Amino acid sequence: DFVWDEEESEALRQARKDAELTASADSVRAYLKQIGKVALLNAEEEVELAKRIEAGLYATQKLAPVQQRRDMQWICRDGDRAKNHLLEANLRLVVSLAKRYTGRGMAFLDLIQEGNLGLIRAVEKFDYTKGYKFSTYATWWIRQAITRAMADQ
């Protein structure tokens, strides 16, 4: 932590000469700041939140002053809340996977967003009964979407 050398001086040398002007295309700081309001789920929520998503997805279609009506009015909103919460929980993985092809002309945020769209697919195109850890399935779909984007270049 408290070390100074010529070899360590270089690491600030190059950054100082080059990075006075901000190349915003890779300035991820705002998005990472926004994601940071997150903590990892567990298996119990991994099942419950997907079930809630399915219930709300059914309710929003079926809907097209008594407890029968109140219950579905509740579920329709709760399922969308569940979808949003799960996506927000998994964003960090999208970032960590978007790192893997940076530097080859592609801006990091583009990979982030392509992986995010793949994840937005993953949140709903899923069944809890399969038993797979959701993070691995999310990684699969994020990488698939990122390479689909990389099919265009």
């Binding site: 079930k51 059914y58 579905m72 069944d127």
Partner: peptide, 26 residues
Amino acid sequence: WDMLLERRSVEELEELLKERLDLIKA
């Protein structure tokens, strides 16, 4: 919406909705 009906039977979706409603009423 299509993938939910296609992947699982409507009976399972109805059962899940009923379970959610009960867990909200419990």
